[PDB]
Design a protein around this ligand. Structure first.
Ligand code: HEM
Ligand SMILES: O=C(O)c1[nH]c(C(=O)O)c(-c2c[nH]c3ccccc23)c1-c1c[nH]c2ccccc12
Ligand SMILES: O=C(O)c1[nH]c(C(=O)O)c(-c2c[nH]c3ccccc23)c1-c1c[nH]c2ccccc12
Ligand SMILES: O=C(O)c1[nH]c(C(=O)O)c(-c2c[nH]c3ccccc23)c1-c1c[nH]c2ccccc12
Length: 411
């Protein structure tokens, strides 16, 4: 052989920031690579090719539950230790980790609230939010584009849909970050899990509070929608509602946050595109799409084999974990010529940054709206966005991929 075993763990900051050279070396050797774990831990098959990633997200014998895959009561349905019960409850209640029919019933109840029509009515306001955020960020000397903008924008947006207090955007953010340490490609040397556990509890109480208050002066916000469904007979527990709010809050902003932050990083490394964008704003929609293919906010998603499946050079046994490398698929030259070139005129609707299949990003249209309106705000409100120095720290995360913070030195 030539290449050693591949996994998303313990990577140095250099590779986390620019993982593409790694996906390339592996993609060129084989579309699928398998990595053995050692005990009663199942093998994992990493998919690097576009076509095979498509197959991972599409084939229905791949599911989200490792317990269903192994047919073993002992194995955890989701990747969180039993020790952490509040965390486990919250996570196994996320739509992304559900299988049909439960998954179908929930998405169905939820999708009407994120329609193209509703996103269009939201734009003028997503615009005043960004403007106000940037307005505030000039008041300070070395602004953090993440805490001061990339995070607050999508949190305030989803907070309104949910029907929660705008004033809680900082509290919401910190608990979402604490919970993120439970993500499967994190360090977790010392209390990542304990913190995520406590965060989960904070969200449980916060959201349990919100619903016992859903006999009030009755709005329409996901919360009410959710509570009214249960009250009228829908198969929904308060844990399920709680988990959904947590899922919508986290999945509803951490992704957009990373897109916005990394987009600033990408445009800075591609000044011709950045300057082209500053002068011709009609290119914004095409830029977003290409920025997404170029450096997707979500680098890896997992699935579990419910039955034997053949992919690439491998015969994946039932019970095997399967990882679709979105970032690697978006830079596969077989699908995107000159993949490392940031070209905003290429056809990129093909990119799998929003996923594919039944779990296709639920807020894609909302995400796209926050992305263009978002980076528009940055482009027009910060002339020196592409000048001067910047400092960034990437999170040790290969699922939700991006900066923990990004300070700029334009006064
Ligand atoms: C530009 C930012 C965003 C990106 C890159 C993104 C990306 C993704 C990806 C790749 C998945 C699939 C994961 C898998 O197959 O395991 C996903 C799922 C999901 N996203 Fe997004 N997302 C973004 C914004 C949003 C927003 C603003 C919301 C609004 C609440 C949202 C809600 C969801 C939900 C609910 C799911 C799970 C749906 C299901 O399992 O059927 N996302 N997202
Ligand atoms: O048990 C689960 O529900 C699970 N779900 C996932 C996932 O990523 O969806 C994992 C997992 C996360 N990282 C892994 C590496 C090798 C094998 C499994 C995993 C696991 C997992 C972690 N440790 C395990 C030990 C035995 C069986 C499954 C897992
Ligand atoms: O940690 C993982 O391995 C993972 N895998 C996925 C996936 O969808 O395959 C997620 C995940 C959870 N919500 C998501 C929204 C968009 C994209 C990915 C996710 C996650 C994930 C993100 N944050 C987490 C916190 C706790 C447990 C899992 C995740
Ligand atoms: O200049 C500041 O006030 C500052 N404050 C911090 C901080 O961490 O609070 C930094 C800084 C230094 N190294 C960092 C890495 C990631 C994020 C921020 C930094 C910096 C910083 C050092 N060099 C810079 C260049 C551009 C922007 C900020 C900084």
């Amino acid at each position: 052989a030539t290449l050693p075993r591949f996994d998303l763990m313990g990577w140095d900051k250099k590779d986390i920031a620019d993982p593409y050279p790694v996906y390339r070396r592996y993609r060129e050797a084989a579309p699928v690579h398998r990595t053995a774990s050692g005990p009663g831990k199942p093998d994992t098959y990493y998919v690097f090719t576009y076509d095979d990633v498509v197959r991972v997200l599409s084939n229905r014998r791949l599911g989200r539950n490792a317990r269903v895959a192994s047919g073993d009561t002992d194995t955890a349905p989701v990747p969180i230790p039993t020790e952490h019960r509040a965390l486990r409850t919250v996570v196994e209640n996320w739509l992304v980790f559900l299988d049909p029919p439960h998954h179908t019933e929930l998405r169905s109840l939820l999708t009407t609230e994120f329609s193209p029509s509703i996103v269009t009515g939201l734009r003028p306001r997503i615009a005043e939010l960004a403007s106000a955020l940037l307005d505030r960020l000039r008041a300070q000397r070395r602004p953090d584009l993440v805490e001061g903008f990339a995070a607050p924008l999508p949190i305030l947006v989803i907070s309104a849909l949910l029907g929660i207090p705008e004033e809680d955007h900082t509290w919401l953010r910190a608990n979402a970050v604490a919970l993120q340490e439970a993500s499967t490609t994190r360090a977790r040397d010392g209390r990542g899990y304990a913190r995520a556990e406590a965060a989960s509890q904070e969200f449980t109480r916060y959201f349990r509070r919100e619903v016992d208050r859903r006999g009030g002066d009755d709005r329409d916000d996901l919360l009410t929608l959710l509570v009214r469904a249960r009250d009228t007979g829908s198969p929904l527990s308060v844990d399920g509602i709680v988990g959904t709010c947590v899922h919508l809050l986290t999945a509803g902003h951490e992704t957009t946050t990373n897109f916005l932050a990394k987009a600033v990083l990408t445009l800075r490394a591609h000044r011709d595109v950045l300057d082209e964008l500053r002068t011709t704003p009609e290119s914004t929609p095409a830029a977003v799409e290409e920025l997404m293919r170029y450096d997707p906010p979500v680098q890896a998603v997992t699935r579990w084999a419910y039955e034997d499946i053949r992919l690439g050079d491998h015969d994946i046994p039932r019970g095997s974990r399967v990882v679709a490398l979105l970032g690697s698929a978006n830079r596969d030259p077989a699908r995107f010529p000159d993949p490392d070139v940031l070209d905003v005129h290429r056809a990129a609707e093909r990119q799998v940054g929003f996923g594919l299949g039944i779990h296709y990003c639920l807020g894609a249209t909302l995400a796209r709206a926050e992305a263009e309106i978002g980076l528009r705000a940055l482009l027009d409100g910060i002339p020196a966005l592409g000048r001067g120095a910047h400092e960034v720290e990437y999170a040790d995360d290969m699922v939700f991929h991006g900066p923990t913070r990004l300070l700029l030195d334009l006064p």
